[PDB]
Structure 1
Amino acid sequence: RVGNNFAMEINLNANLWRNFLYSNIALYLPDKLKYSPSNVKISDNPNTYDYMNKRVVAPGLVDCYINLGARWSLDYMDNVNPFNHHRNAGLRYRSMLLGNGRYVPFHIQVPQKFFAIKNLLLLPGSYTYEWNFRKDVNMVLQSSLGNDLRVDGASIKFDSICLYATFFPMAHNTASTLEAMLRNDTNDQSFNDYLSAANMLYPIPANATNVPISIPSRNWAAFRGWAFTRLKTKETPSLGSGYDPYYTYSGSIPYLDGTFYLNHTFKKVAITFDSSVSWPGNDRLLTPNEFEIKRSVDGEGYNVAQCNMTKDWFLVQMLANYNIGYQGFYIPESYKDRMYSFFRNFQPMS
């Protein structure tokens, strides 16, 4: 051979980066950015796997040159449930815990979570213990794509259910004495639900911007405060009724599992007692009449942490979560900054 050998060139690193982008972000983009394939049969039901699997998305929407040099979440994905993804380690693990096949004979142990009895020490006697279990696959099962499992053939059957109980082999004289003490009302047991809250859900019509709520005159003694988020109706099953006919979704359910992800869509909150008295009032906040969560350019001066959050809101959240704020701002101690805490999940971007 005279000259150099025959060679073909390929950019390895660029390819790997690209494949990562298309697989993890592109394909999960909102359906409005996709289009149906030509000459291929595709289902009419958008809650179908076939539909979510055949709708085609252009790689150029999230290519390797997308927002180069930046740490930025795509505006299109901010409001897309991040947990309904194949890289959700928790879901992936529970999926493999059952096996890698479609047909699975399962055997599981289910815990009692009701606060009034979960840690109760039950004394001698005979008790009727009865409970109800769901069979609706959209409720008991979870998918990473979130397709309608009722339509997509998922099925479940309960063959047998037993109740197990373990007893400390306590000395009989001691158990007997402990029983006597615990039967006096002075030594009654007591528990409180950890969440400790009355849960309300108010509808926000598509494109609605203002959400006013009203609580008729009542007693507020012992009131502890407010906590709130925003959920998608499609991802929130109707509870109370034993079966929700219009529930055609099987992804994460923020309302029940805590996979909240829409906190960034709140603008401000105004609180008013007896339709005239503003709370907290007293000219406490920089914008005294309301809680401004974020501002748009016009009021940059009142923002902090290098993002659109206001100084007022950052201060309140830091105090509410860690009591940090009146004597300087600093990273809270790890043991107080848990998984569902404010700081741990705060991500400013530009």
Structure 2
Amino acid sequence: VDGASVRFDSVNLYATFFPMAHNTASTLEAMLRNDTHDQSFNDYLSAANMLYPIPAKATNVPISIPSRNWAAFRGWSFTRLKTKETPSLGSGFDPYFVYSGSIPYLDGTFYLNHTFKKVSIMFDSSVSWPGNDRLLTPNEFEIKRSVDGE
């Protein structure tokens, strides 16, 4: 509601080339296009992040992944972000996004991370993921032990 960056006068590209000799540059390729050695890159934060809403003044938020395979899965990661400061992930506008300030979902600056307890993990009716290799508590990864706790 206060000023805007509407004008984008012009954009361009800038590709810098290594002035490699044409004999080696034609040997670098024409050997780099064999199917034996094709380059492969992996996303650093390789993750399948979703967003589960938490109503105002709410207790434990339950989630449930249906039956599926867990072949190469390696670990969870979770924090909570305020909804007033998270875009709707949809293309174009979202007129219900009226905060401009850091965006933890994008920038990577989380602060509500210090509010968690009892992150219990259960497989199918087998409610202990660590299970046999027990922690000090047997069932759930307890965090932020309350006023109690001997």
Same fold (TM over 0.5): yes
The reply on whether 1:293 has 2:122 as its aligned counterpart is no
The offset of 1:248, in angstroms, is 0.5
Aligned-pair RMSD on alpha carbons?
Answer: 1.2
User: CA–CA distance in 1 between the matches of 2:106 and 2:63?
Assistant: 23
Check whether the contact 2:86–2:103 (CA below 8 A) recurs between aligned residues: yes
Identity among equivalent positions (%) equals: 92
Paired with 2:102 and 2:139, the residues of 1 have a C-alpha distance of 36
Q: Describe the superposition over 1:69-119 as per-residue Cα deviations: whole angstroms up to 9, x where unpaired.
A: xxxxxxxxxxxxxxxxxxxxxxxxxxxxxxxxxxxxxxxxxxxxxxxxxxx
* CA distance, structure 2, for counterparts of residue 242 and residue 185 of structure 1: 39
Distance in 1 separating the partners of 2:2 and 2:83: 21
1:154 aligns with 2:26: no
Structure 2 unaligned segments of length 5 or more: list them.
Answer: none
Q: Give the number of equivalent residue pairs.
A: 150
Instruction: Return the structure number with greater relative CO, CA threshold 8 A, min gap 6.
Output: 1
Are the equivalent residues in 1 in contact too, given 2:127–2:139 (CA < 8 A)? no
Distance 1:152 1:209 in 2: 38
Q: TM-score, normalised by structure 1?
A: 0.42
Query: Structure 1 residue 276: deviation in Å?
Result: 2.4
Residue 274 of structure 1 and its aligned partner are, at CA, apart by 1.2
TM-score by length of 2: 0.95
- The structural deviation recorded for 1:283 is 4.8
Which structure: greater helix fraction?
1
**2: CA distance, partners of 1:215 / 1:248:** 32
Q: State how far apart, in whole Å, the 1-side matches of 2:31 and 2:125 are.
A: 51
Cα deviation, residue 229, structure 1: 0.5
Gaps of 5+ in 1: 1-150, 301-350
Which residue in 2 is equivalent to 1:163? 13
Where in structure 1 do 4 or more consecutive aligned residues deviate above 4 Å?
Answer: none
Q: Which residue of 2 aligns with 1:246?
A: 96
Compared CA separation, residues 160 and 297, structure 1 to 2 (3 A): same
Change (3 A) 1:228 1:166: same
Please state whether the residue corresponding to 2:71 is helix, strand or coil: coil
1:256 alignment partner, SS class? helix
